[PDB]
Amino acid sequence: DQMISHRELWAKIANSINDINEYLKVYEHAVSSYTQMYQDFSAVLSSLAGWISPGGNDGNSVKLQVNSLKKALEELKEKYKDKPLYPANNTVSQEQANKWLTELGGTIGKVSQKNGGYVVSINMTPIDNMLKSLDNLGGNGEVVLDNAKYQAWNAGFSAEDETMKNNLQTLVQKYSNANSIFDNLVKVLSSTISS
Amino acid sequence: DQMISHRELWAKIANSINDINEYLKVYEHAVSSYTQMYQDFSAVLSSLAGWISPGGNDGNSVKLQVNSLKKALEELKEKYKDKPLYPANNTVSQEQANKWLTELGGTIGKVSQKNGGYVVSINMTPIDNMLKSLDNLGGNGEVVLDNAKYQAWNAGFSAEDETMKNNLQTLVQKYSNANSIFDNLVKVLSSTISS
Ligand SMILES: C[C@H](CCC(=O)O)[C@H]1CC[C@H]2[C@@H]3CC[C@@H]4C[C@H](O)CC[C@]4(C)[C@H]3C[C@H](O)[C@]12C
Ligand SMILES: C[C@H](CCC(=O)O)[C@H]1CC[C@H]2[C@@H]3CC[C@@H]4C[C@H](O)CC[C@]4(C)[C@H]3C[C@H](O)[C@]12C
């Protein structure tokens, strides 16, 4: 083709730098949103010790304060109902949301609707699973479980905690890799047209 | 400012592709070389299950084939004494091997001399630590260890295993990231050529 000027060359690069920055900011916001939710959830698990007391007359059953635990988990759900993983502002097409959902992890997000568009919500399945487990315990707002049943339910609570913690570390790793790839790509690209 | 032609822009991008390609070729041999080492060590790992057996008069202690394990580790160390991470063949400067040891991390390699020149050998210190820990167990071909002694020894053995495992994954992750830099640089070149 013809010639390209220095100004249009660097205008293309400045525009590409902005496009790369917006791409990396998607990972950064997804990490920050999921981190805040996991921190909120971890405070619920550490509060569990204060929501249980001796149950049977032998004293080796466990009385679970089910209404306290569900209220804490339900407030968790409502807090993040309108805090999507992507995008941080406004909405995108359903197809664009589906692509970013696969890019981040199918079990970490979930596509939902907003303002006539679509977003990638935080997948609340770990929270829904424990709200479901608590309702299957029955009871009068307070349930008395035998020791074997409490340890079984407690282990399921800790398994959901581990799933979310591993999801976060996976997302943190994807962000760190994307960061170093595109930080160095910009450094390479800037270095080689400057000289 | 000065105007550049499309062809000169292609050549600028192309020489960066060639620069990264030279970097990738050296980095790839270090990955395959260290992968082969850890794969051979995992062959020693799978044979360790058959080298421990009940050894107490009550069955409470652990009987370890310390000589078979020691000999297997020394053969692993001797197999890779002349197989360096860099260069793939011949030698290199002390300056050159020094900086390529820094680019590879410094933990996975060690600069050594080979007939006037220098190489970046595989750092076998995790294997040497295992050998001194085994030597500390004593015995004569086979040792009987109480449960406490076996668990302490196994924890140290596990830590050196995890050292090599983590060494490999950091190496693989950096190789993958540099490959993605290459791929995106190729996307840039392909786009500017078609434009
Ligand atoms: C995939 C993301 C966009 C993700 C999104 O939809 O928001 C885009 C945004 C910025 C994009 C890059 C912009 C610079 C480069 C432009 C080239 O012509 C093609 C490769 C590069 C390196 C792009 C690669 C990549 O296509 C990127 C990273
Ligand atoms: C820092 C990144 C790798 C990021 C990572 O995965 O850790 C590395 C990977 C490829 C590296 C380049 C390889 C080619 C060049 C080798 C030179 O001797 C030093 C500058 C160059 C241009 C390197 C620059 C940079 O050091 C790079 C981009």
CSV table of C-alpha atoms and ligand atoms in Angstrom, one decimal:
chain,number,residue,atom,x,y,z
A,1,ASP,CA,0.0,0.0,0.0
A,2,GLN,CA,1.0,3.6,0.5
A,3,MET,CA,2.7,5.3,3.5
A,4,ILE,CA,1.6,5.6,7.1
A,5,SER,CA,2.4,8.6,9.2
A,6,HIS,CA,3.9,8.7,12.7
A,7,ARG,CA,0.8,10.2,14.1
A,8,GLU,CA,-1.7,7.7,12.7
A,9,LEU,CA,0.7,4.9,13.7
A,10,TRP,CA,0.7,5.9,17.3
A,11,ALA,CA,-3.0,6.8,17.3
A,12,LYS,CA,-3.7,3.1,16.3
A,13,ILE,CA,-1.4,2.0,19.1
A,14,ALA,CA,-2.9,4.3,21.7
A,15,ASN,CA,-6.4,2.9,20.7
A,16,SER,CA,-5.1,-0.7,20.9
A,17,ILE,CA,-3.7,0.1,24.4
A,18,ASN,CA,-7.1,1.3,25.5
A,19,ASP,CA,-8.8,-1.8,24.1
A,20,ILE,CA,-6.3,-4.0,25.9
A,21,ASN,CA,-6.8,-2.1,29.1
A,22,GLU,CA,-10.6,-2.5,28.9
A,23,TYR,CA,-10.0,-6.2,28.3
A,24,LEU,CA,-7.8,-6.6,31.4
A,25,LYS,CA,-10.3,-4.5,33.4
A,26,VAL,CA,-12.9,-7.2,32.8
A,27,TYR,CA,-10.7,-9.8,34.6
A,28,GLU,CA,-9.9,-7.3,37.3
A,29,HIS,CA,-13.5,-6.5,38.1
A,30,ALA,CA,-14.5,-10.2,38.0
A,31,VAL,CA,-11.8,-11.0,40.5
A,32,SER,CA,-12.8,-8.1,42.7
A,33,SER,CA,-16.5,-9.0,42.6
A,34,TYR,CA,-15.9,-12.7,43.3
A,35,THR,CA,-13.4,-11.9,46.1
A,36,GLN,CA,-15.9,-9.7,47.9
A,37,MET,CA,-18.6,-12.3,47.7
A,38,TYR,CA,-16.2,-15.1,49.0
A,39,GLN,CA,-15.1,-12.8,51.8
A,40,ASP,CA,-18.7,-12.2,52.7
A,41,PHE,CA,-19.4,-16.0,52.6
A,42,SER,CA,-16.3,-16.8,54.7
A,43,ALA,CA,-17.6,-14.5,57.4
A,44,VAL,CA,-20.8,-16.6,57.4
A,45,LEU,CA,-18.9,-19.8,57.9
A,46,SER,CA,-16.7,-18.4,60.7
A,47,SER,CA,-20.0,-17.2,62.3
A,48,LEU,CA,-21.4,-20.8,62.3
A,49,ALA,CA,-19.5,-21.7,65.5
A,50,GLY,CA,-21.6,-19.1,67.4
A,51,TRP,CA,-24.9,-20.4,65.8
A,52,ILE,CA,-24.7,-23.9,67.3
A,53,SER,CA,-25.1,-25.2,70.8
A,54,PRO,CA,-25.5,-28.6,72.6
A,55,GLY,CA,-28.7,-30.4,71.6
A,56,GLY,CA,-29.8,-33.6,73.2
A,57,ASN,CA,-30.1,-34.3,76.9
A,58,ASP,CA,-27.0,-36.5,76.6
A,59,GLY,CA,-25.6,-33.3,75.2
A,60,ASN,CA,-23.9,-34.8,72.1
A,61,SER,CA,-26.5,-33.6,69.6
A,62,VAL,CA,-26.1,-30.2,68.0
A,63,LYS,CA,-28.8,-27.5,67.9
A,64,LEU,CA,-28.4,-25.4,64.7
A,65,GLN,CA,-29.7,-21.8,64.6
A,66,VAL,CA,-31.1,-22.3,61.1
A,67,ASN,CA,-33.0,-19.0,60.9
A,68,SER,CA,-29.8,-17.0,61.7
A,69,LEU,CA,-27.8,-18.9,59.1
A,70,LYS,CA,-30.5,-18.6,56.3
A,71,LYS,CA,-30.9,-14.9,56.9
A,72,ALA,CA,-27.2,-14.4,56.6
A,73,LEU,CA,-27.1,-16.5,53.3
A,74,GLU,CA,-30.2,-14.8,51.9
A,75,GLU,CA,-28.8,-11.4,52.6
A,76,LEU,CA,-25.7,-12.6,50.7
A,77,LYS,CA,-27.8,-13.5,47.7
A,78,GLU,CA,-29.6,-10.2,47.6
A,79,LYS,CA,-26.4,-8.2,48.0
A,80,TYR,CA,-25.0,-9.7,44.8
A,81,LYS,CA,-28.2,-10.0,42.8
A,82,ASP,CA,-27.3,-6.7,40.9
A,83,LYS,CA,-23.5,-7.0,41.2
A,84,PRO,CA,-22.5,-8.9,38.0
A,85,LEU,CA,-19.1,-10.3,37.2
A,86,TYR,CA,-19.3,-8.7,33.8
A,87,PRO,CA,-19.8,-6.0,32.7
A,88,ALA,CA,-19.2,-3.6,35.6
A,89,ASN,CA,-21.4,-1.0,33.9
A,90,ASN,CA,-24.5,-1.3,31.7
A,91,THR,CA,-25.2,-4.5,29.6
A,92,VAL,CA,-24.1,-6.4,26.5
A,93,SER,CA,-25.7,-8.8,24.1
A,94,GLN,CA,-26.6,-12.4,25.1
A,95,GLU,CA,-23.9,-13.7,22.7
A,96,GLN,CA,-21.2,-11.4,24.2
A,97,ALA,CA,-22.2,-12.5,27.7
A,98,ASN,CA,-22.0,-16.2,26.8
A,99,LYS,CA,-18.5,-15.8,25.4
A,100,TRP,CA,-17.2,-14.1,28.6
A,101,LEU,CA,-19.0,-16.7,30.7
A,102,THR,CA,-17.0,-19.5,29.0
A,103,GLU,CA,-13.8,-17.3,29.3
A,104,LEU,CA,-14.3,-17.0,33.0
A,105,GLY,CA,-15.7,-20.4,34.0
A,106,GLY,CA,-19.2,-21.8,33.6
A,107,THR,CA,-19.7,-22.6,37.3
A,108,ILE,CA,-18.3,-19.2,38.4
A,109,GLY,CA,-20.8,-17.0,36.5
A,110,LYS,CA,-24.3,-17.3,35.1
A,111,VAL,CA,-26.0,-15.3,32.3
A,112,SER,CA,-29.0,-13.2,33.3
A,113,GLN,CA,-30.9,-10.2,32.0
A,114,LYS,CA,-30.8,-6.6,32.8
A,115,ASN,CA,-32.2,-3.4,31.3
A,116,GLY,CA,-33.1,-5.2,28.1
A,117,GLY,CA,-29.5,-6.5,27.7
A,118,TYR,CA,-27.6,-9.3,29.3
A,119,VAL,CA,-24.9,-9.6,32.0
A,120,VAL,CA,-22.8,-12.4,33.6
A,121,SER,CA,-24.0,-12.7,37.1
A,122,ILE,CA,-22.1,-14.3,40.0
A,123,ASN,CA,-23.1,-18.0,40.1
A,124,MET,CA,-24.8,-18.4,43.5
A,125,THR,CA,-25.2,-22.2,43.2
A,126,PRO,CA,-22.9,-22.7,46.3
A,127,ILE,CA,-25.2,-20.4,48.3
A,128,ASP,CA,-28.4,-22.0,46.8
A,129,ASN,CA,-27.0,-25.4,47.7
A,130,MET,CA,-26.7,-24.6,51.4
A,131,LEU,CA,-30.0,-22.8,51.6
A,132,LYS,CA,-31.5,-26.0,50.1
A,133,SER,CA,-29.6,-28.2,52.6
A,134,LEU,CA,-30.9,-26.1,55.5
A,135,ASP,CA,-34.5,-26.3,54.3
A,136,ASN,CA,-34.2,-30.1,54.0
A,137,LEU,CA,-33.3,-30.2,57.7
A,138,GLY,CA,-36.9,-29.4,58.6
A,139,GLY,CA,-37.4,-27.9,62.1
A,140,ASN,CA,-38.8,-24.9,63.9
A,141,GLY,CA,-36.3,-22.3,62.9
A,142,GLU,CA,-34.0,-24.3,65.1
A,143,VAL,CA,-33.1,-27.9,64.4
A,144,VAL,CA,-31.5,-30.6,66.6
A,145,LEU,CA,-29.2,-32.9,64.7
A,146,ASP,CA,-27.5,-36.0,66.0
A,147,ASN,CA,-23.7,-35.8,65.9
A,148,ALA,CA,-23.4,-38.0,62.8
A,149,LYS,CA,-25.9,-35.8,60.9
A,150,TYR,CA,-24.3,-32.5,61.9
A,151,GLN,CA,-20.8,-33.6,60.8
A,152,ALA,CA,-22.4,-34.7,57.5
A,153,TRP,CA,-24.1,-31.4,57.0
A,154,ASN,CA,-21.1,-29.4,58.2
A,155,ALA,CA,-18.8,-31.3,55.8
A,156,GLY,CA,-21.1,-30.3,53.0
A,157,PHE,CA,-20.9,-26.6,54.1
A,158,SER,CA,-17.1,-26.8,54.1
A,159,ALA,CA,-17.1,-28.5,50.6
A,160,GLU,CA,-19.0,-25.5,49.2
A,161,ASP,CA,-16.5,-23.2,50.8
A,162,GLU,CA,-13.7,-25.1,49.1
A,163,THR,CA,-15.4,-24.9,45.7
A,164,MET,CA,-15.7,-21.1,45.9
A,165,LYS,CA,-12.1,-20.7,47.2
A,166,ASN,CA,-10.8,-22.8,44.4
A,167,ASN,CA,-12.9,-20.8,41.9
A,168,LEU,CA,-11.4,-17.6,43.1
A,169,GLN,CA,-7.8,-18.9,42.8
A,170,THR,CA,-8.5,-20.1,39.3
A,171,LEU,CA,-9.8,-16.6,38.4
A,172,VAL,CA,-6.9,-14.9,40.1
A,173,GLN,CA,-4.5,-17.1,38.0
A,174,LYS,CA,-6.3,-16.3,34.7
A,175,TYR,CA,-6.0,-12.5,35.5
A,176,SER,CA,-2.3,-12.7,36.4
A,177,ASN,CA,-1.6,-14.6,33.2
A,178,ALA,CA,-3.6,-12.2,31.0
A,179,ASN,CA,-1.9,-9.3,32.8
A,180,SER,CA,1.7,-10.5,32.1
A,181,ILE,CA,0.8,-11.5,28.5
A,182,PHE,CA,-0.6,-8.2,27.4
A,183,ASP,CA,1.6,-6.0,29.6
A,184,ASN,CA,4.6,-7.5,27.7
A,185,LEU,CA,2.9,-7.4,24.4
A,186,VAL,CA,2.4,-3.6,24.7
A,187,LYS,CA,6.1,-3.3,25.8
A,188,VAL,CA,7.2,-5.3,22.8
A,189,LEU,CA,4.9,-3.4,20.3
A,190,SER,CA,6.0,0.0,21.7
A,191,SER,CA,9.7,-0.9,21.7
A,192,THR,CA,9.8,-2.1,18.1
A,193,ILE,CA,8.2,0.9,16.3
A,194,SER,CA,10.1,3.3,18.5
A,195,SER,CA,13.4,1.9,17.2
B,1,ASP,CA,7.0,13.4,11.5
B,2,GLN,CA,8.6,10.8,9.3
B,3,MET,CA,6.3,8.6,7.3
B,4,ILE,CA,7.0,4.8,7.2
B,5,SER,CA,5.9,2.4,4.5
B,6,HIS,CA,3.6,-0.6,5.2
B,7,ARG,CA,6.5,-3.0,4.2
B,8,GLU,CA,8.9,-1.4,6.8
B,9,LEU,CA,6.2,-1.8,9.4
B,10,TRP,CA,5.8,-5.5,8.6
B,11,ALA,CA,9.6,-6.0,8.9
B,12,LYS,CA,9.6,-4.3,12.3
B,13,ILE,CA,7.0,-6.7,13.5
B,14,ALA,CA,8.5,-9.7,11.8
B,15,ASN,CA,11.9,-9.2,13.5
B,16,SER,CA,10.2,-9.1,16.9
B,17,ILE,CA,8.5,-12.3,16.0
B,18,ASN,CA,11.9,-13.8,15.2
B,19,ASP,CA,13.4,-12.4,18.4
B,20,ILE,CA,10.6,-14.0,20.5
B,21,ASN,CA,10.9,-17.2,18.5
B,22,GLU,CA,14.6,-17.5,19.4
B,23,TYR,CA,13.6,-16.9,23.0
B,24,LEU,CA,10.9,-19.6,22.7
B,25,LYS,CA,13.2,-22.2,21.2
B,26,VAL,CA,15.7,-21.9,24.2
B,27,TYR,CA,12.8,-21.8,26.7
B,28,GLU,CA,11.1,-24.9,25.1
B,29,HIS,CA,14.2,-27.1,25.5
B,30,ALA,CA,14.4,-26.2,29.2
B,31,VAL,CA,10.8,-27.2,29.6
B,32,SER,CA,11.1,-30.6,27.9
B,33,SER,CA,14.4,-31.2,29.7
B,34,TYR,CA,12.9,-30.5,33.1
B,35,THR,CA,9.7,-32.3,32.2
B,36,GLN,CA,11.7,-35.5,31.4
B,37,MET,CA,13.5,-35.2,34.7
B,38,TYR,CA,10.4,-35.0,36.8
B,39,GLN,CA,8.7,-37.7,34.8
B,40,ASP,CA,11.7,-40.0,35.6
B,41,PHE,CA,11.4,-38.9,39.3
B,42,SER,CA,7.7,-39.8,39.3
B,43,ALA,CA,8.7,-43.3,38.1
B,44,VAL,CA,10.8,-43.5,41.3
B,45,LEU,CA,7.7,-42.2,43.1
B,46,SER,CA,5.4,-45.0,41.8
B,47,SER,CA,8.0,-47.5,42.8
B,48,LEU,CA,8.1,-46.1,46.4
B,49,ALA,CA,4.7,-47.7,47.2
B,50,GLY,CA,6.3,-51.1,46.7
B,51,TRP,CA,9.3,-50.2,48.8
B,52,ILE,CA,7.3,-49.6,52.0
B,53,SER,CA,5.6,-52.4,53.9
B,54,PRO,CA,4.4,-53.3,57.4
B,55,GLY,CA,7.6,-53.9,59.4
B,56,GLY,CA,6.7,-54.0,63.1
B,57,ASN,CA,6.4,-57.1,65.2
B,58,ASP,CA,2.9,-55.8,65.9
B,59,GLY,CA,2.7,-54.3,62.4
B,60,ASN,CA,2.8,-50.8,63.7
B,61,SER,CA,6.1,-49.7,62.2
B,62,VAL,CA,7.2,-49.0,58.6
B,63,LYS,CA,9.8,-51.1,56.7
B,64,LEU,CA,11.5,-49.0,54.0
B,65,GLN,CA,13.8,-50.3,51.2
B,66,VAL,CA,16.3,-47.4,51.8
B,67,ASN,CA,19.0,-48.9,49.5
B,68,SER,CA,16.7,-49.3,46.5
B,69,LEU,CA,15.3,-45.8,46.9
B,70,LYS,CA,18.8,-44.4,47.3
B,71,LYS,CA,20.2,-46.1,44.2
B,72,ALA,CA,17.2,-45.0,42.2
B,73,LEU,CA,17.8,-41.4,43.1
B,74,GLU,CA,21.5,-41.6,42.4
B,75,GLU,CA,20.8,-43.0,38.9
B,76,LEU,CA,18.3,-40.2,38.3
B,77,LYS,CA,21.0,-37.7,39.3
B,78,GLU,CA,23.6,-39.3,37.1
B,79,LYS,CA,21.3,-39.6,34.1
B,80,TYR,CA,20.8,-35.8,33.9
B,81,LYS,CA,24.4,-34.7,34.9
B,82,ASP,CA,25.2,-34.2,31.2
B,83,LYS,CA,21.7,-33.0,30.1
B,84,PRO,CA,21.5,-29.2,30.6
B,85,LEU,CA,18.6,-26.9,30.5
B,86,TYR,CA,20.6,-24.5,28.2
B,87,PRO,CA,22.1,-24.7,25.7
B,88,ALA,CA,20.6,-27.8,23.9
B,89,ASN,CA,24.1,-28.5,22.6
B,90,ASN,CA,27.7,-27.3,23.0
B,91,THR,CA,28.6,-24.7,25.6
B,92,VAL,CA,28.2,-20.9,26.2
B,93,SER,CA,29.8,-18.0,28.1
B,94,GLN,CA,29.8,-17.5,31.8
B,95,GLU,CA,28.0,-14.2,31.1
B,96,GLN,CA,25.5,-16.0,28.9
B,97,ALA,CA,24.7,-19.0,31.1
B,98,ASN,CA,24.4,-16.5,34.1
B,99,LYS,CA,21.7,-14.4,32.5
B,100,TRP,CA,19.8,-17.4,31.1
B,101,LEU,CA,19.8,-18.9,34.6
B,102,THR,CA,18.1,-15.6,35.8
B,103,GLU,CA,15.6,-15.8,32.9
B,104,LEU,CA,14.7,-19.4,33.9
B,105,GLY,CA,14.2,-18.5,37.6
B,106,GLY,CA,17.5,-19.6,39.2
B,107,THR,CA,16.0,-22.3,41.3
B,108,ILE,CA,15.6,-24.9,38.5
B,109,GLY,CA,19.1,-24.6,37.1
B,110,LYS,CA,22.7,-24.2,38.1
B,111,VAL,CA,25.6,-22.8,36.0
B,112,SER,CA,28.3,-25.4,35.5
B,113,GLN,CA,31.5,-25.7,33.5
B,114,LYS,CA,31.9,-28.2,30.6
B,115,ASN,CA,35.2,-28.3,28.7
B,116,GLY,CA,36.2,-24.7,28.6
B,117,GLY,CA,32.6,-23.5,28.3
B,118,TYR,CA,29.6,-23.2,30.6
B,119,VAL,CA,26.1,-24.7,30.7
B,120,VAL,CA,23.0,-24.2,32.7
B,121,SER,CA,22.6,-27.7,34.3
B,122,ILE,CA,19.5,-29.0,36.0
B,123,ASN,CA,19.6,-28.1,39.7
B,124,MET,CA,19.4,-31.5,41.4
B,125,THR,CA,19.6,-30.1,44.9
B,126,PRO,CA,16.1,-31.5,45.7
B,127,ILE,CA,17.4,-35.0,44.9
B,128,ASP,CA,20.6,-34.3,47.0
B,129,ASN,CA,18.4,-33.2,49.9
B,130,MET,CA,16.4,-36.5,49.6
B,131,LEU,CA,19.7,-38.5,49.6
B,132,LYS,CA,21.1,-36.8,52.8
B,133,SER,CA,17.7,-37.3,54.5
B,134,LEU,CA,17.8,-41.0,53.5
B,135,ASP,CA,21.4,-41.2,54.8
B,136,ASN,CA,20.3,-39.8,58.1
B,137,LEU,CA,17.9,-42.8,58.5
B,138,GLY,CA,20.9,-45.2,58.7
B,139,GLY,CA,20.2,-48.9,58.5
B,140,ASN,CA,21.8,-51.4,56.1
B,141,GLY,CA,19.9,-51.8,52.9
B,142,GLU,CA,16.6,-51.8,54.7
B,143,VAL,CA,15.4,-49.8,57.8
B,144,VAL,CA,12.5,-50.2,60.1
B,145,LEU,CA,11.0,-46.8,61.2
B,146,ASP,CA,8.4,-46.1,63.8
B,147,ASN,CA,5.3,-44.2,62.6
B,148,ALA,CA,6.5,-40.9,64.0
B,149,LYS,CA,9.9,-41.2,62.2
B,150,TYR,CA,8.3,-42.3,58.9
B,151,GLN,CA,5.9,-39.4,58.9
B,152,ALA,CA,8.6,-36.9,59.6
B,153,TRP,CA,10.8,-38.3,56.8
B,154,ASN,CA,7.9,-38.5,54.4
B,155,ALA,CA,6.9,-34.9,55.0
B,156,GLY,CA,10.5,-33.8,54.0
B,157,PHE,CA,10.4,-36.1,51.0
B,158,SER,CA,7.0,-34.6,50.0
B,159,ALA,CA,8.3,-31.0,50.3
B,160,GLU,CA,11.2,-31.7,47.9
B,161,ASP,CA,8.8,-33.4,45.5
B,162,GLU,CA,6.5,-30.3,45.7
B,163,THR,CA,9.6,-28.1,45.0
B,164,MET,CA,10.2,-29.8,41.7
B,165,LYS,CA,6.5,-29.9,40.9
B,166,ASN,CA,6.2,-26.2,41.5
B,167,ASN,CA,9.4,-25.5,39.6
B,168,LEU,CA,7.9,-27.3,36.6
B,169,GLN,CA,4.6,-25.5,36.7
B,170,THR,CA,6.2,-22.1,36.9
B,171,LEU,CA,8.3,-23.0,33.9
B,172,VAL,CA,5.4,-24.3,31.9
B,173,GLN,CA,3.3,-21.3,32.8
B,174,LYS,CA,5.9,-18.8,31.6
B,175,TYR,CA,6.4,-20.8,28.4
B,176,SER,CA,2.7,-20.7,27.8
B,177,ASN,CA,2.5,-17.0,28.4
B,178,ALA,CA,5.4,-16.3,26.1
B,179,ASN,CA,3.7,-18.5,23.4
B,180,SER,CA,0.6,-16.4,23.8
B,181,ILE,CA,2.7,-13.2,23.3
B,182,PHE,CA,4.0,-14.8,20.1
B,183,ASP,CA,0.5,-15.7,18.9
B,184,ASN,CA,-0.9,-12.2,19.6
B,185,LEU,CA,2.2,-10.7,17.8
B,186,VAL,CA,1.4,-12.9,14.8
B,187,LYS,CA,-2.2,-11.6,14.9
B,188,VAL,CA,-0.8,-8.1,14.8
B,189,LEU,CA,1.4,-8.9,11.8
B,190,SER,CA,-1.4,-10.7,10.0
B,191,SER,CA,-3.7,-7.7,10.5
B,192,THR,CA,-1.3,-5.0,9.3
B,193,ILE,CA,-0.4,-7.1,6.2
B,194,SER,CA,-4.1,-7.5,5.1
B,195,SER,CA,-4.8,-3.8,5.8
C,1,LIG,C1,-10.3,-10.4,22.8
C,1,LIG,C2,-10.0,-9.0,23.1
C,1,LIG,C3,-11.4,-8.3,23.3
C,1,LIG,C4,-12.3,-9.0,24.3
C,1,LIG,C5,-13.6,-8.3,24.3
C,1,LIG,O1,-14.5,-8.6,23.5
C,1,LIG,O2,-13.8,-7.3,25.1
C,1,LIG,C6,-9.2,-8.1,22.1
C,1,LIG,C7,-9.2,-6.6,22.7
C,1,LIG,C8,-8.0,-6.0,22.4
C,1,LIG,C9,-7.5,-7.0,21.3
C,1,LIG,C10,-6.3,-6.9,20.8
C,1,LIG,C11,-6.0,-5.7,20.4
C,1,LIG,C12,-4.5,-5.6,19.7
C,1,LIG,C13,-4.3,-6.4,18.9
C,1,LIG,C14,-5.1,-5.9,17.5
C,1,LIG,C15,-5.0,-7.0,16.4
C,1,LIG,O3,-5.8,-6.6,15.2
C,1,LIG,C16,-5.4,-8.3,16.8
C,1,LIG,C17,-4.5,-8.7,18.1
C,1,LIG,C18,-4.5,-7.6,19.3
C,1,LIG,C19,-3.4,-8.1,20.4
C,1,LIG,C20,-6.1,-7.7,20.1
C,1,LIG,C21,-6.2,-8.9,20.7
C,1,LIG,C22,-7.6,-9.1,21.3
C,1,LIG,O4,-8.5,-9.4,20.2
C,1,LIG,C23,-7.9,-8.3,21.8
C,1,LIG,C24,-7.2,-8.5,23.2
C,2,LIG,C1,8.8,-11.1,30.2
C,2,LIG,C2,8.4,-11.8,29.0
C,2,LIG,C3,7.8,-13.1,29.5
C,2,LIG,C4,6.7,-12.9,30.6
C,2,LIG,C5,6.5,-14.2,31.4
C,2,LIG,O1,5.9,-15.1,31.0
C,2,LIG,O2,7.1,-14.2,32.5
C,2,LIG,C6,9.6,-12.2,28.0
C,2,LIG,C7,9.0,-13.4,27.1
C,2,LIG,C8,9.6,-13.2,25.8
C,2,LIG,C9,10.6,-12.1,26.1
C,2,LIG,C10,11.2,-11.5,25.1
C,2,LIG,C11,11.8,-12.3,24.4
C,2,LIG,C12,12.7,-11.6,23.1
C,2,LIG,C13,13.4,-10.7,23.5
C,2,LIG,C14,14.8,-11.6,24.3
C,2,LIG,C15,15.8,-10.6,24.9
C,2,LIG,O3,16.8,-11.3,25.6
C,2,LIG,C16,15.2,-9.7,25.8
C,2,LIG,C17,13.9,-8.9,25.1
C,2,LIG,C18,12.9,-9.9,24.3
C,2,LIG,C19,11.9,-8.9,23.5
C,2,LIG,C20,11.9,-10.6,25.5
C,2,LIG,C21,11.2,-9.8,26.2
C,2,LIG,C22,10.4,-10.4,27.3
C,2,LIG,O4,11.4,-10.7,28.4
C,2,LIG,C23,9.9,-11.2,27.1
C,2,LIG,C24,8.6,-10.8,26.5
